[PDB]
Amino acid sequence: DSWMEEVIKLCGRELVRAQIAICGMSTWS
Amino acid sequence: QLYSALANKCCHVGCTKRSLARFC
Incomplete structure (x- = not known):
């Protein structure tokens, strides 16, 4: 993971997984 | 929707x- 950038190619539930992960792991600036 | 836009994108x-x- 890298909150400065990251470009992913996900879909559906994986996309939501990435969302849940990204928005939950926002402890890092 | 905005989420659907993201989803497709x-x-x-x-x-x-x-x-x-x-x-989120």
Whole structure:
């Protein structure tokens, strides 16, 4: 993971997984 | 919808993790 950038190619539930992960792991600036 | 736009975008070309970050 890298909150400065990251470009992913996900879909559906994986996309939501990435969302849940990204928005939950926002402890890092 | 905005989520559907993101959904299609990431599924086609991709999107930034920062982009899903602003959506959640």
